[PDB]
């Protein structure tokens, strides 16, 4: 061994392992085996605000700090005409309370 | 130890002495009148800040 | 605050009583005895800048090149008996006796200085490791002890060369002589030297005084020399049997450090002064209040390196104001210190009791709500003394260039008051009386605006906008842009609706203090410190008529009394007007008239001080300052000529080069305000008296004489010398590596180097800074205000801006610099003599040589070399791939012409290609290098080298060393290059084959000195005699002395001068009376 | 072929003046500092500053403008090459909408995906990315952190770009999974056409 | 630069040659995936952030600003010093640059 | 930042900062120069000045 890696070969290796990570599934709102949706009985205007707050919370957990610098919830612009995918509505357009 | 010149009182802090001397003009009756004026106007809800009714 | 703490402790010796507290135990005993932080670092740097150690003396000799034995000569052998030799008979030898001897560099190694400098170049002989002095700068990314990055080679050589120059800053101090008694030298004097021994050193110093027995190379060289050129031959002495002034000696010394110390001696002797002009300059600075005296007799040629030009003072002043830009906490202790010093000197004494003693005689009626005597004494409350703010406000006159004394808001009457308000009238008088002593330019517009802020609704005058209206607080007017133009165009004031405001401005415009001036110091011995003003002259806000008589006594014929009288006259009109108040009754009214009559009568010697005396104290103190003055032109009552800023630059902005073109857009604005108290200034103006009898010549004689024991200004001069020398050394040495704007001559570029950057050039700058601070024993901060910026494109200038937009600027010329001169000279002589620092030019060739020849690898025959324009040579480079062979066919390689060629023929590599693929080539090439005739020449310009010797009578092989080297080449670093060089013999020896791989390209064997040093001749080896081209003086009788052929050799022997001067304290020579 | 960046690039250089005005970032910082200097100039826009802070203000703003910070130089030269190197190795290859400087008309506001054909008509089933105020999902930042990172930052003093990126990019390519994604996209496209 | 030297064969096989269209449709799947969800995007963005942090030669310290602004030792007796004001506003204690 | 109306927000921040000394011509009666710059997030709100 003579040549040290000048940026650090394993230190790049861990970071590119982390950057390798594939695309996370988002399967809610889609029909299951039987024909039902796979969501949580939440309408989307609370659902997307909920998952945005949870993504900011996971971002703060990923950082060492307690309050996250980059945030996704209450950024400064409003998001009232917004709706994500979840399992309130079926494919047909009605309420999946049954 | 710090002692003020009016009232001969003695304290241990020079900031306490300065506040004490600041607590310590014109005629005695004029001070009487401004004290009774400010005491008359000290707690009125003009200077003071901070089921029914159809 | 003066108080008393309730203490613990009871005893008193005299009167045998016991008491309450130690705080008055000590006073009672006294009655018995009577009766019967980087900011702190730079602040202390300014207050006591540590002086350098310039003048340092060398006993012994000046030589940085020693001759070192490498392999020992045989004392016994069969072909020649031992009686031929000289080591048999133990006769000391001038040059080292050995079989092979080389010369290497090593700093002083024969010196007896009093003060060392931890700055040295100690190079081992080239048989062992010598890489550790070529990695001292940037190689903190190399594991290998034996490794070094090639791109750092030029920077390392330049830093080591700066160390080599920086060490030889001494002067060859004289010791003494002794007349010979042996007939070796016919009657020639021999020079002694101190130290623990003196035996071998005489034979070391003087070669040709040895004997000549035999046909050895040493004695054969010495026998063909010139006889008389040894020892003392010239001197100069003045007094009867005293110390000789200087001599010249014929000793061994290389011409390089002789030239270094000669140019250093001349540079130092430029700065010499003599005690007569010391006496003249000090008397001129004292203005004849204190005289001193120099002797009038033939001296002993004293040495006092003190005189400099004005450029050094200006440049160091720029650097110091650039250091202290925008803090105010550096400049606060300076003003406090000048305040303490002037408080010690000044002849007056302040007592506030004049105010009480007068104002207790004003008329009164005691039945009023108020009468103004108690109000003036309450609002003036003069019971304390504590008058240091007066001296602070005085000494800000020296430094309107950096500091602006203003008045705090607490001295302003709380968002205005009433004219019928008595305490607000007194606050107006305190303020408007205190205002003519500060250095702020908006002081007169504050002086006007306080009155208009006071009176609102009584009289209203046209204002400027809706923002800075009449009811604006008066402290907001602190730029010349915010002057209400009704104050300038006074006809805009309604002359019949606002009479009291019209005439107040008439008092301002006529009577606000006009600036004047006075001279100080001299530019004869020390320099001219100012730059925005002409030299020698001092700017002051108030007219200064000199004293007619030396016994002062009170009169009223001056500007401050006239100012006070007109202010009192306006307040007399203000109480006299029938519209403002008839409302006060006649007793209080007439009491006001009497109070103002006594106030316009009041006696004080303080305006006489500020008119006739106080600039004389200022002109006396202004030469003896650690922080010399820095001023702007004072102007009153002008929109135009008021300055708005002052700023310093550090570097050039763009591709533009000339600082006159690059200045105004790129600076660092310097300046702080400074709050003060007005009523302290007011009482210090109003109540100041003198001693009851006094004469000025006696008073200032005793008051000024004791501060003339210092050497502090003469220390500051040397400090500024080293400052300006180091900044020119920085710009030259950074210009050596990076593309800068200054005209230099880049020498060392055959050495490859890093494509530099701002961070790398800044790094190299602070290595230079650590070297310069390690030299001369300076621990305080120096060159860091330029290290903060970019070191690559520096410039030094300054300007202030007039309010219209006119820009006066000063660009001082950088003076000559002998450290940079010596560095350029040593770089030139290193370019022509590079082998001594362990460097070989050119490159190497890798290939097998089985032969019985004895040629030296540092001087190969030209059959074994090839270059770019050699027929049948493949030159490689960037696009280089290796295609493997198949089925026995040869693997091939990509040419830069796109061709493919087998592993044969003469090849040329850049070193970077080998470094980038240093692994993958090793499993491809080495088996073809060891056996096949694949021959590779790797160009790298410069490298440190390693020597290995062998007996030629046996077998030798280099594949272990070369396999080690080819393996240990790293993309970052390389190891040093080994060589297999034979050993010269003297008798006929048997030949044996040897196998060599690493050959140099051109001649690099300049470091050799002599071969075998004992025999009549050297047979079958690399042979070279003692170099006659060095000892020019011994071998050329036509050549006169003081003749050096320095730009190619160093000659190892010349004449050198030797001084015996003396560096005394200033009080040891010149004293007062 | 191209990677749409909101900043101008430059060939890879290391030696250049720290004070360069060809650099758009350093030009922007110097001119904004000069403008706020011009705001302070005459003191007129503010009363109440009872001391004359204009000298200290111009001093500290000029001291900010003259600074060693090599971050704008990094963002001009080195960072676009790094993004171009990283960009083919991504599990989610980049999805870019065109940058505009100051045209009002060429600003994109809505991104949507249609499932139907061009010829037929149906009810508008708008894709769910359209239901956003901005063009996408928002993301707040720390302007303090952006400013201090732009305002301070420097290089290692042994920097050779060839050696650095040679050691650096090599183990990153050792974790390439581009080729698996190229196998994956076949399955995706075939599944789409079988579905229709 | 890279190279991949090899022997002349015929039955060697690696299936990797695709067209533009499959990449485009995989992009449209992966962007329909996002589904107006914030948790779905932030691991990719955070890991490429860490990868930039480990690939960058540019390191950042706030002590350049601290050494330039030579205004320290904040007395409580203050005259609203703007240099110390911007030092307290920029906060060079932090070292978070995500 | 990738926000397209960032120059408009950079202008409007100083426009809001200078409420009291310098004014601009305005579009309708509804808005005010003293509007916070957070609202100008979409190009249909850009000022013609």
DSSP letters spanning D40-77: HTTSTT-----S-THHHHHHHHHHHHS----HHHHHHH
Report which DSSP code applies to C68.
E
Q: Which residues of A touch D131 (CB under 8 A)?
A: 81-83
Is the CB of residue C331 less than 8 Å from the CB of residue C324?
yes
Q: By three-state DSSP, how is residue C292 classified? A: strand
Residue-by-residue DSSP string for A11-62: HHHHHHHHHH--PPP--TTSB-SSS-B-S-S--HHHHHHHHHHHHHHHHHHH
Cβ contact, residue pair C4, B3, below 8 Å: yes
Residue-by-residue DSSP string for F10-38: HHHHHHHHTTTT-----S-SS--SS--TT
Cβ contact, residue pair B1, C369, below 8 Å: no
Residue in chain C nearest E81 by alpha carbon: C327
Which of C831-858 are b and which e, b meaning 16 or more Cβ less than 10 Å from the residue's Cβ? bebbbbbbbbbbbbbbbbbeeeebbbbb
Is the CB of residue C645 less than 8 Å from the CB of residue C669?
yes
Q: What technique determined this structure? A: cryo-EM
For testing contact with chain E, the best of A5, A23, A27, A37 (most E CBs within 10 A):
A23
Is the CB of residue D52 less than 8 Å from the CB of residue C478?
yes
Annotated binding site of B: 4, 6-7, 20, 24
**Could you tell me which residues come within 8 angstroms of residue C332 by beta carbon, excluding any fewer than 6 positions away?**
C674
Q: How far is CA C660 from CA C314, C808, D36, D58, in A?
A: 17, 11, 25, 21
Residue in chain D nearest C476 by alpha carbon: D50
Nearest CB among A2, A4, A6 relative to C968 is that of A2
CB–CB contacts below 8 A, D to E: 124
Is the CB of residue C380 less than 8 Å from the CB of residue C430?
yes
Q: Chain D: give the shortest CA distance to residue C172, in Å.
A: 41
| Chains B and A: 3 or more CB pairs within 8 Å of each other | no
Q: How far is CA D53 from CA C27, C400, C412, D30, in A?
A: 48, 16, 19, 21
Residue in chain C nearest E75 by alpha carbon: C329
Neighbours of D60 (CB within 10 A): 25
Q: By three-state DSSP, how is residue C445 classified? A: helix
Q: Which residues of A touch C144 (CB under 8 A)?
A: 2
Residue in chain A nearest E33 by alpha carbon: A26
Chain C residues contacting B, CB < 8 Å?
A: 1, 3-7, 369-370
Please give the distance of CA C567 from its chain centroid, rounded to a whole number: 52
Nearest CB among C479, C666, C671 relative to D66 is that of C666
Q: How far is CA C586 from CA A30, A57, C572, in A?
A: 101, 81, 15
| C132 annotated to bind ligand | no
Which resolution in angstroms does this entry have?
Answer: 3.4
d(CA A52, CA A46): 10
Q: Chain F: give the shortest CA distance to residue A16, in Å.
A: 25
Q: Which residues of F touch D135 (CB under 8 A)?
A: 4
d(CA C836, CA C104): 6
Q: How far is CA A4 from CA A7, A13, C140, in A?
A: 9, 15, 12
Nearest CB among C3, C7, C369 relative to B3 is that of C3
Chain C: touching chains (3 or more CB pairs < 8 Å): A, B, D, E
CB contacts under 8 A, C 141-160 vs D, are 141, 149, 151-152
d(CA C647, CA D54): 13
Cβ of residue A77 closer than 8 Å to a chain E Cβ: no
Q: How far is CA D165 from CA A6, A9, D118, D171, in A?
A: 9, 11, 48, 11
Cβ of residue C549 closer than 8 Å to a chain A Cβ: no
Nearest CB among C1, C7, C369 relative to B14 is that of C1
d(CA D192, CA D182): 16
d(CA A96, CA A90): 6
Residue-by-residue DSSP string for C638-701: -SSS-EEEEEE--B--SS---HHHHSTTS-EE--EEE---HHHHHHHHHSEE--SS--HHHHHH
Cβ contact, residue pair C37, E3, below 8 Å: no
Q: Give the strand pairing for C906-910 and C873-875.
A: parallel
Q: Chain D: give the shortest CA distance to residue C540, in Å.
A: 22
Alpha-carbon torsion (C858, C861, C867, C872), positive or negative: negative
Q: In this structure, what token pair is assigned to residue C37?
A: 């932080």
d(CA D84, CA D103): 27
Cβ contact, residue pair B17, C1, below 8 Å: yes
- N-to-C CA span, chain E: 32
| C12 annotated to bind ligand | yes
Q: Which residues of D touch C647 (CB under 8 A)?
A: 58-59, 62
Cβ of residue A80 closer than 8 Å to a chain F Cβ: no
Q: How far is CA C190 from CA C177, C231, C1056, in A?
A: 6, 5, 14
Cβ of residue E4 closer than 8 Å to a chain C Cβ: no
Q: In this structure, what token pair is assigned to residue A34?
A: 């039987």
From C224, C197, C210, C232, select the one nearest C95 (Cα to Cα): C210
Residue whose tokens read 């006649």: C586
Give the containing element (helix H, strand E) for C442.
Answer: none
Cβ of residue F32 closer than 8 Å to a chain A Cβ: no
d(CA D193, CA B53): 70
Sort C642 into a burial class: Cβ within 10 Å, 0-12 / 13-18 / 19+. buried
Sort D153 into a burial class: Cβ within 10 Å, 0-12 / 13-18 / 19+. buried
CB contacts under 8 A, E 28-67 vs D, are 28-32, 34-36, 38, 41, 44, 48, 51-52, 55-65
CB–CB contacts below 8 A, B to C: 19
Cβ contact, residue pair A23, D142, below 8 Å: no
Cβ contact, residue pair F4, D45, below 8 Å: no
| C15 annotated to bind ligand | yes
d(CA B11, CA C287): 53
Chain A: touching chains (3 or more CB pairs < 8 Å): C, D, E, F
- Phi/psi of residue C60, each to 5°? 110, -120
Neighbours of C116 (CB within 10 A): 12
Residue in chain B nearest C7 by alpha carbon: B1
Q: Which residues of E touch C879 (CB under 8 A)?
A: 1
Q: Chain D: give the shortest CA distance to residue C780, in Å.
A: 23
Query: Angle between the D71-86 and D24-40 helix axes, to the nearest 10 degrees?
Result: 140
| C14 annotated to bind ligand | yes
- Phi/psi of residue C254, each to 5°? -70, 150
CB contacts under 8 A, A 1-60 vs E, are 7, 11-12, 15-16, 18-19, 21, 23-24, 26, 29, 44, 48, 51-52, 54-56, 58-59
Q: Chain F: give the shortest CA distance to residue A29, in Å.
A: 30
Q: Give the strand pairing for C956-957 and C994-1000.
A: parallel
Q: Chain C: give the shortest CA distance to residue A11, in Å.
A: 16
Q: How far is CA C20 from CA B12, C12, C25, in A?
A: 17, 11, 8
Residue in chain C nearest B13 by alpha carbon: C5
| Chains D and F: 3 or more CB pairs within 8 Å of each other | yes
Q: In this structure, what token pair is assigned to residue C347?
A: 């002849």
Q: Give the strand pairing for C403-405 and C672-674.
A: parallel
d(CA C869, CA C733): 36
């Amino acid at each position: 061994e003579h040549y040290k890696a000048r940026p650090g070969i394993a230190s790049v290796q861990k970071a590119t392992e982390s950057a390798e990570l594939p695309m996370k599934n988002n399967d809610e709102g889609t029909p299951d085996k039987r024909g039902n949706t796979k969501g949580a009985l939440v309408n989307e205007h609370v659902e997307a605000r909920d998952e945005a707050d949870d993504a900011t919370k996971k971002q703060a957990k990923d950082t060492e700090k307690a309050k996250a610098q980059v945030t996704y919830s209450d950024t400064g612009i409003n998001n009232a005409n917004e709706l994500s995918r979840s399992g309130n509505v079926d494919n047909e357009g009605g309420s999946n309370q049954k | 130890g710090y002692q003020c010149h009016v009232c001969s009182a003695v304290l241990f802090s020079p900031l306490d002495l300065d506040a004490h001397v600041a607590s310590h003009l014109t005629s005695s009756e004029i001070q009487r009148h401004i004290t009774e004026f400010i005491s008359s106007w000290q707690n009125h809800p003009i200077v003071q800040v901070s089921k029914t009714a159809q | 605050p003066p108080t008393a703490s309730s203490g613990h402790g009871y005893q008193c010796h005299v009167c045998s009583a016991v008491l309450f507290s130690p705080l008055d135990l000590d006073a009672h005993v006294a009655s018995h005895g009577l009766h019967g932080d980087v900011e702190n670092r730079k602040t202390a740097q300014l207050l006591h800048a540590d002086t350098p150690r310039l003048v340092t003396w060398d006993a012994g000799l000046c030589t940085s090149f020693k001759i070192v034995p490498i392999v020992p000569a045989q004392v016994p052998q069969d072909v020649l008996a031992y009686t031929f030799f000289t080591s048999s008979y133990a006769i000391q030898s001038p040059f080292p006796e050995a079989a092979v001897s080389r010369i290497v560099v090593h700093t002083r190694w024969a010196s007896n200085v009093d003060f060392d400098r931890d700055s040295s170049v100690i190079m081992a002989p080239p048989t062992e490791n010598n890489i550790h002095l070529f990695k001292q700068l940037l190689n903190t990314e190399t594991l290998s002890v034996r490794g070094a990055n090639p791109l750092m080679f030029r920077a390392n050589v330049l830093h080591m060369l700066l160390e080599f120059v920086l060490d030889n800053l001494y002067l060859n101090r004289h010791t003494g002589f002794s007349q010979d008694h042996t007939p070796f030298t016919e009657g020639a004097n021999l020079r002694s030297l101190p130290g623990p021994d003196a035996e071998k050193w005489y034979s070391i110093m003087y070669p040709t005084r040895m004997g000549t027995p035999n046909v050895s190379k040493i004695c054969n060289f010495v026998a063909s020399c010139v006889r008389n050129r040894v020892g003392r031959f010239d001197r100069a002495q003045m007094m009867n049997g005293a110390m000789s002034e200087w001599v010249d000696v014929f000793e061994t010394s290389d011409a390089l450090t002789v030239s270094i110390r000669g140019r250093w001696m001349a540079r130092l002797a430029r700065m010499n002064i003599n005690p007569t002009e010391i006496e003249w300059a000090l008397t001129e600075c004292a203005q004849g209040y204190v005289t001193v005296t120099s002797p009038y007799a033939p001296s002993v040629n004293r040495l006092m390196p003190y005189r400099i030009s004005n450029a050094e003072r200006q440049i160091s002043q720029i650097i110091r104001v650039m250091n202290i830009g925008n803090n105010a906490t550096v400049i606060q202790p300076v003003l406090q210190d000048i305040s303490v010093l002037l408080q010690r000197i000044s002849p007056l004494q302040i007592d506030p009791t004049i105010i009480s003693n007068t104002m207790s005689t004003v008329s009164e009626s005691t039945t009023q709500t108020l009468s103004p005597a108690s109000s003036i004494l309450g609002k003036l409350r003069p019971s304390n003394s504590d008058f240091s703010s007066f001296r602070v406000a005085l000494a800000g006159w020296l430094y309107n260039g950096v500091v602006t004394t203003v008045i705090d808001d607490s001295s302003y009457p709380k968002d205005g008051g009433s004219v019928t308000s008595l305490e607000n009238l007194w606050d107006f008088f305190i303020l408007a009386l205190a205002l003519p002593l500060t250095t702020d330019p908006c002081a007169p517009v504050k002086a006007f605006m306080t009155l208009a802020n006071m009176m609102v609704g009584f009289e209203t005058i046209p204002m400027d906008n809706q923002i800075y209206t009449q009811s604006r607080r008066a402290s907001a007017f602190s730029t010349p842009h915010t002057w209400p133009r009704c104050f300038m165009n006074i006809q805009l004031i309604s002359p019949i609706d606002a009479p009291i405001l019209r005439q107040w401005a008439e008092i301002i415009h006529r009577y606000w203090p006009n600036p004047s001036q006075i001279r100080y110091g001299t530019p004869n011995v020390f320099g001219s410190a100012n730059l925005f003003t002409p030299p020698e002259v001092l700017l002051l806000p108030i007219d200064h008529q000199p004293a007619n008589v030396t016994t002062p006594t009170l009169d009223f014929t001056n500007e401050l009394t006239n100012w006070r009288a007109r202010v009192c006259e306006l307040m007399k009109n203000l109480v006299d007007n029938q519209r403002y108040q008839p409302g006060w009754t006649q007793s209080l009214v007439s009491s006001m008239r009497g109070t103002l009559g006594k106030l316009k009568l009041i006696k004080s010697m303080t305006p006489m001080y500020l008119q006739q005396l106080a600039p004389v104290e200022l002109a006396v103190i202004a030469p003896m300052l650690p922080f010399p003055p820095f001023q702007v032109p004072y102007v009153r009552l002008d929109r135009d000529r008021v300055p708005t800023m002052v700023g310093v630059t550090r570097q050039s902005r763009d591709t533009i080069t000339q600082p006159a073109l690059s200045l105004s857009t790129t600076n660092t604005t310097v300046g702080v305000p400074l709050a003060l108290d007005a009523r302290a200034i007011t009482v210090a103006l109003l109540s100041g008296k003198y001693p009851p009898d006094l004469v000025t010549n006696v008073w200032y004689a005793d008051a000024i004489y004791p501060m003339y024991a210092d050497t502090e200004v003469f220390s500051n001069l040397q400090r500024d010398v080293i400052t300006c020398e180091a900044v020119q050394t920085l710009v030259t040495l950074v210009a050596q590596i990076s593309e800068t704007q200054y005209p230099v001559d880049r020498y060392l570029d055959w050495i490859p180097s890093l494509r530099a950057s701002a961070a790398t050039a800044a790094t190299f700058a602070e290595w230079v800074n650590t070297s310069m601070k390690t030299a001369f024993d300076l621990s305080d901060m120096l060159l860091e205000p330029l290290l903060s910026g970019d070191p690559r494109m520096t410039q030094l200038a300054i300007q202030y801006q007039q309010y219209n937009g006119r820009t006066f600027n000063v660009i001082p010329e950088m003076p000559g610099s002998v450290i940079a001169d010596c560095v350029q000279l040593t770089a030139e002589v290193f370019n022509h003599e590079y082998n001594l620092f362990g460097i070989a030019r050119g490159d190497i060739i890798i290939g097998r040589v089985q032969s019985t020849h004895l040629w030296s690898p540092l001087a190969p025959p030209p059959d074994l070399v090839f270059d770019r324009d050699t027929p049948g040579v493949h030159i490689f480079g960037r696009d280089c791939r290796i295609s493997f062979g198949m089925n026995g066919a040869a693997p091939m390689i990509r040419d830069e012409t796109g061709m493919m060629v087998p592993f044969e023929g003469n090849w040329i590599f850049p070193l970077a290609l080998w470094q980038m693929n240093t692994r993958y080539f090793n499993q491809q090439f080495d088996a073809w290098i060891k056996t096949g005739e694949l021959r590779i020449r790797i160009e790298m310009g410069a490298y440190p080298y390693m020597l290995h010797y062998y007996d030629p009578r046996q077998y030798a092989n280099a594949w272990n060393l070369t396999s080690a080297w080819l393996e240990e080449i790293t993309p970052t670093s390389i190891p040093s290059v080994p060589f297999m060089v034979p050993i010269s013999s003297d008798h006929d020896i048997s030949s044996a084959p040897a196998v060599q791989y690493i050959i140099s390209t051109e001649y690099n064997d300049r470091s050799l000195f002599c071969t075998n040093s004992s025999s009549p001749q050297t047979i079958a080896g690399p042979d070279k005699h003692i170099p006659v081209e060095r000892y020019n003086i011994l071998t050329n009788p036509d050549a006169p002395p003081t003749q050096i052929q320095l730009p190619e050799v160093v000659d190892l022997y010349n004449v050198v001068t030797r001084y015996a001067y003396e560096t005394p304290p200033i009080t040891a020579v010149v004293m007062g009376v």
